[PDB]
Ligand binder design. Structure first.
Ligand SMILES: Nc1ncnc2c1ncn2[C@@H]1O[C@H](COP(=O)(O)OP(=O)(O)OP(=O)(O)O)[C@@H](O)[C@H]1O
Ligand SMILES: Nc1ncnc2c1ncn2[C@@H]1O[C@H](COP(=O)(O)OP(=O)(O)OP(=O)(O)O)[C@@H](O)[C@H]1O
Ligand SMILES: Nc1ncnc2c1ncn2[C@@H]1O[C@H](COP(=O)(O)OP(=O)(O)OP(=O)(O)O)[C@@H](O)[C@H]1O
Ligand SMILES: [Mg+2]
Ligand SMILES: [Mg+2]
Ligand SMILES: [Mg+2]
Ligand SMILES: [Mg+2]
Lengths: 524, 524, 524, 182
């Protein structure tokens, strides 16, 4: 309808106001000594949190343009979370630091394009420096430290992640779920993990993790874009008679077949789950057959005439468990016989032998690794169900952080990595002077996270930041103990992936908001 | 939607305003001589109460941030109530005292972390001192005094609780309900008490206690996560034909099964009750078999193929009564033969003999204690049903208080315990000066409850507090008689668990409020 | 209802205000160095776009008359987009330039008719000059450059378009869709393209392209305007039983048939697609029989008694795919045998031989070209489905731009073509002085797009525009590299059709608003 | 009275807005193509003038901070009028340009005192360069050209002033007054 349009300086001022509000509200929770934020949980008691993710999620400014700026920086922090699993607060702190200085530069009269080029160059150089300073994470000690640091100082999370990590190799498939009692357990089931997000967010039965859990489910191996719900109706009735959950690996469920199935999720005919089918054509049928032989099911495809109307319970797959995330789906301990799995992996190994292209060999090696490795199951022994879900979510996010670390290395925590990077890149320049100014803005932003942590601790950020900059290597300020020392020695590690993703995304949103000239919104 | 965000000083000022409003409204009711609070009972007549629980529950500030502050100090007081059953007003009085002084310190310029560390250290030392000064509660006289004091001067409650307590030992299971006549009756039956909460609050038929009472119910021993209401529909029909109430001990009723059971419970086909199954795997099946042999029923499990579709009336358990609370469920006088119970306890004793781990031996000894100990039934007698319910609720809360006392000792009542603790810890100091200031704030808070009681009595709190501080041991001020004397001699006892929980929770909420920097709420 | 009427100067002032708002919001995104515009995407995160089409689409002024002016200049830009596929922002930039200067001329006192005549004359001369300066686009190099420039610096789009273009000739039929994976493919199916827009916008299953895709559908070769759905109800049931999609090439679907087909299309009983039948009388039946022989179906017509009630599954045509746009519909690999197609094209060649009129020979030659040439299929390869849709949309719009270029030539990009045209037409005059003023206004407008691009780059538009005007031929300012040079050498090409359409439409809307005297709108 | 105090960039922006208002009023009267400015007078008819000093004198803004900026940059035109008698529009144009570019550097973290020192050094060197680049203006033709350019390209005024200085020499005194004729 009628819309309000802001141009230039007014638009950027509103942007900065909204970004400042969100960034303050989130950054007050950065570091181990973060403050508390009281979020009004509607009718119930307020939730006091030190988690910047929740504070950012709950922030929605009244003013439409300020709200828009807050939402953009928030969503870029969310991109950082998705890419890394940690550093959303750091990304917001970095984003505000570039944005506040950058928008001041724009309001001065400097060219937004030059500033964006300078910040892009500085952040690219910063990522190169972080890769240079990154130390590979292969020993279980570093993995435990990373898990502890990403679990908000939880040593048990770090040590369990390290144990399960070394048990199945650094590239192995690891899953976590609730335990039996108050003791943890480590198991090696024979399953696999294929990228398949849920086709509807309403499938989520776990609000603490945004994932769908099915125990002893029925795996339907559709190789056709499902458009109607009528042709699996006998199959749905058979599953309901069986009572086990039903999940669907189809190419794409579109139209009413989705919506009706969506409706079924609140009707509870079965525990409906729908995921996309990874791979295409030959690859799609290859991993579909792999899932069939892992779960003992049969691949049903319309091309071979195997229509969903004739799909019986025997053709339907079966496994011990399945987990569905927004990006990938892990099938856990399929009931298919070990002999069939061994035959399938042998066939794919001879496919590797006959393969000549690098892509073919690499993909088939990934396939055989997926089938042979299985899944590492962790049964965390927390006391209560609330503690079950919270500890398992912490373990999951810290596990993702550890995987990011082992794929990209680790660096000094507490913002020391960015401090060292800024010290290394202090001399970097650009084509013109405004690019150099953007570089300086990015360097101050790199300083920002450690300063914010020290500010949260109550100490003066200037003295501590100067002391850390004076030190070399990984010298820094342990905030939890409020004492200086080597971050690696005191276990304050940051996954290099986390830091590089946070900085890159903060630079992205900063440049986007700096170069923005007009904003349109619904009129109040 | 749109949200209002407060930062720092404004946030904490709103916090203090809300806390002050709630704390005044509640603390005017502390002690035997508490004032009256008139709560508007909507259309009907107002309710005058001296019970701080009701006053706190009815308090909901108009201003959103003041509302959040009041709501969460209220919820911390509720945590104290749940942990102890008494000292809700004392927890609020302590909470206001720390928050008022602590937030004054923050507004001065002192560091919130330093204050929180100091308060936490002072409260930990206070709990140690309270444990040191606690006198074990084993004689029936002390139990009677604690029961009387937790019911706000109800001698009959204390004496009946003491009698039932000594009848079945300090670790026995005790339940209370309405008697036949106007006199109290003490009985010993063969029941048991397993931790389980009702899966829906709508099951509560007793608003005065938040508990579900089923007389002569049908116990269904589910060992499976119930997800549908279809499979026990014949069982529901059989129960409705019988007419007795139906309760289900299930692992977890999730999905549409819970919703259908709720729809049934406001449709009243049967008296539907659902509780979670305590224990896991071997322990779960062990206590399920214990319940089966106590109630004469048969364990129904899908693993052995004993599916709920074939569940008949014979397999259903039967007992004299069952009481369901939010955390624990007690079965009263199951119809199983004494010979079967004796055989089961003999089997578990043999399990104890063959067990070697301390955990297994302790768990099996707990099982045999719960089985062979029996249940002390108190058929309390009152003139009217309203008086019946009020007396039984007072007896229940005082019984919980007596259990807390016998598990943690007793201390001088009327705030004398905290006065003595502050006198003992006057010399305690922290790492820096602001930690010492937080310690002093905690000590003044320790003084606060006795001062508030004396203020309620109309006397000057300063003179009486000075006189109590000058005295040593358990010397204090009897408020009901308005005269000094030994707290134990005049029966003014406090369960040590009550006081330590109230102080610890008050310190927790105070530190959370002090370290809080930002608040978000829905825009008015 | 009640309406607000503006007259003369006030109306034109409102025109200018609304046009200025929209033109600013869109023009801040012109050129490779365009700024960012933040569009509020309702509840979700804001969308940052440099695409002027989206910014123009969002803009809707609150003031009714300002909104009206913005909407009409926006719709003229949309006409330019539809006619060319590119230059929407350029059309708006040109429109504002004429409008701002023209409405100043009207407010001065000059005659609107004289200004409109002058602008029309200048734009006609500009189109003649652009045709003169246009260089034919036949080599794959120029096609690749045009595809890259229309896709906003996407070299892969340009090269793939050039390859597919040279594969099937400059007049060949080319279609694009999603590929298998990350790799592209170039094939030539046997199909044809006919002008038939969808009869309901709700048929669109591709919001990113506004097109309807049916994979392996059933073609209904109806030769009658379908106004009732009852008589194909058995056909609809048969199609639903088969499960394949369904499209109708009837003359028109209107009234009850249209409403019921729409109801079906949100109910999704079958994938309903309705398109009008191209051709008339002999031509209509001729192309209907061509579709029948290509898809192996049978033409169903009420004139020969072949009523839709007796239409069985065999009579319906079958093809590999079909794409429906708002203006034309393309079939993809009909299942008709190649022998039947060869016989049909031989018959139409004999018709060419027997044809005497130029129209008959040309139409039959077009028919044989459509049948024999087939359809070029591009399976573009991208990582993700969202990337699939975005890359295929960019490829489609750049393909339309390349077709416009090859049918009208190419000119210097970055507004250099219009600068050169203004330099050539600087001497042109009109009947009276105000016509000359309109000519000068149009010349400044021709200068406007390059000036706006340079302004977006941050450089001074005056110096760069003077330097470009000083140069001759195709000398200009590469904005992406921020350096001068030959546009053809640096690959900054503009399809001459795009530029002439943008300029002509801008002149059209400018003259319409200048000659406008009265406004009526709904009263606020 | 009660004071409003504005710090940093808010104060600088308001000051610059006032300077921009005054200088925009003044600088539409610069050059041969510069236009005129109407100044409303409390007594009599409005004054149509092209002098930058008159426009600068008349400018006073509602906002107290913008008015502070305007009254501060008005001193450039006033001092230029008092000292040289001409160049008041050029003086105001130069002042605003130094202010606009100076405030840009101040916003970029530069030290304003050192910016002032650099501006002063540049202007001292510029005065030296002007003294070097100047040429004597002694003949009547150059005086006619100077007067013509200073009278907004009015050749009659320049010729009249050249004739007046020729008649009264170096020691004579020339004054300008109202005349009856056309
Ligand atoms: N003991 C410590 N001393 C100093 N810095 C620490 C310490 N522990 C963690 N850090 C640093 O503090 C940051 C962790 O803060 P926090 O976990 O609150 O937020 P985050 O990593 O930005 O993201 P998220 O809110 O999503 O968890 C990291 O930069 C980490 O290196
Ligand atoms: N006769 C008495 N003289 C002095 N203090 C007493 C006397 N009886 C009880 N007290 C003290 O007064 C307090 C009891 O007050 P009250 O029961 O109103 O509130 P509470 O214990 O804070 O909690 P709740 O409101 O939940 O019952 C305890 O601290 C108790 O030790
Ligand atoms: N590298 C370049 N240097 C200079 N001008 C360029 C360059 N690349 C493209 N252009 C010019 O910039 C314009 C392309 O801008 P843009 O694609 O944002 O908008 P548009 O052509 O008006 O239409 P649309 O918004 O519908 O795509 C064209 O005039 C093109 O000739
Ligand atoms: Mg973190
Ligand atoms: Mg009490
Ligand atoms: Mg374009
Ligand atoms: Mg002059």
């Amino acid at each position: 309808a009628a819309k309000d349009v802001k141009f230039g300086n007014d638009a950027r001022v509103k942007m900065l106001r909204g970004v400042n509000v969100l960034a303050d509200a989130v950054k007050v929770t950065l570091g181990p000594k973060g403050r508390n934020v009281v979020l009004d949980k509607s009718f119930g008691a307020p939730t006091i949190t030190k988690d910047g993710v929740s504070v950012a999620r709950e922030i929605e400014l009244e003013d439409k343009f300020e709200n828009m700026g807050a939402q953009m920086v928030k969503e870029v922090a969310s991109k950082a979370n998705d890419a890394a699993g940690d550093g959303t607060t750091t990304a917001t702190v970095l984003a505000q630091a570039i944005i506040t200085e950058g928008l001041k530069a724009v309001a001065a009269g400097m060219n937004p394009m030059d500033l964006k080029r300078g910040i892009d160059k500085a952040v690219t150089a910063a990522v190169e420096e972080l890769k240079a300073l990154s130390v590979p994470c292969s020993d279980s000690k570093a993995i435990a430290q990373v898990g502890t640091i990403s679990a908000n100082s939880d040593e048990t999370v770090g040590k369990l992640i390290a144990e399960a990590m070394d048990k199945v190799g650094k590239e192995g498939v690891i899953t976590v779920e609730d335990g039996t009692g108050l003791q943890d357990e480590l198991d090696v089931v024979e399953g696999m993990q294929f990228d398949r997000g849920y086709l509807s967010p309403y499938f989520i039965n776990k609000p603490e993790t945004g994932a769908v859990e099915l125990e002893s489910p029925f795996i339907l191996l559709a190789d056709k874009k499902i458009s109607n719900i009528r042709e699996m109706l006998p199959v749905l009735e058979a599953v309901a008679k069986a009572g086990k959950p039903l999940l669907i690996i189809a190419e794409d469920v579109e139209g009413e077949a989705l919506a009706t199935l969506v409706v079924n999720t609140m009707r509870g005919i079965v525990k409906v789950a729908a995921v996309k089918a990874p791979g295409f054509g030959d690859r799609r049928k290859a991993m579909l057959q792999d899932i069939a032989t892992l779960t003992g099911g049969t691949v049903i495809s319309e091309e071979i005439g195997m229509e969903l109307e004739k799909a019986t319970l025997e053709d339907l797959g079966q496994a011990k468990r399945v987990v569905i995330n927004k990006d990938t789906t892990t099938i856990i301990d399929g009931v298919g016989e070990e002999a069939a799995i061994q035959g399938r992996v042998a066939q794919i190994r001879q496919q590797i032998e006959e393969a000549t292209s690098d892509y073919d060999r690499e993909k088939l090696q990934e396939r055989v690794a997926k089938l042979a490795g299985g899944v590492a199951v962790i049964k965390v022994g927390a006391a209560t169900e609330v503690e079950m879900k919270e500890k398992k979510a912490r373990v999951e996010d810290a596990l993702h952080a550890t995987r990011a670390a082992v794929e990209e290395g680790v660096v000094a925590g507490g913002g020391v990595a960015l401090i060292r990077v800024a010290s290394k890149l202090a001399d970097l320049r650009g084509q013109n002077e405004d690019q150099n100014v953007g570089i300086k803005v990015a360097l101050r932003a790199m300083e920002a996270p450690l300063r914010q942590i020290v500010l949260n601790c109550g100490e003066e950020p200037s003295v501590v930041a100067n002391t850390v900059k004076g030190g070399d290597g990984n010298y820094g300020y342990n905030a939890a103990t409020e004492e200086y020392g080597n971050m690696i020695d005191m276990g304050i590690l940051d996954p290099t992936k986390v830091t590089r993703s946070a900085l890159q995304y903060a630079a992205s949103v900063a440049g986007l908001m700096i170069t923005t000239e007009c904003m349109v919104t619904d009129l109040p």
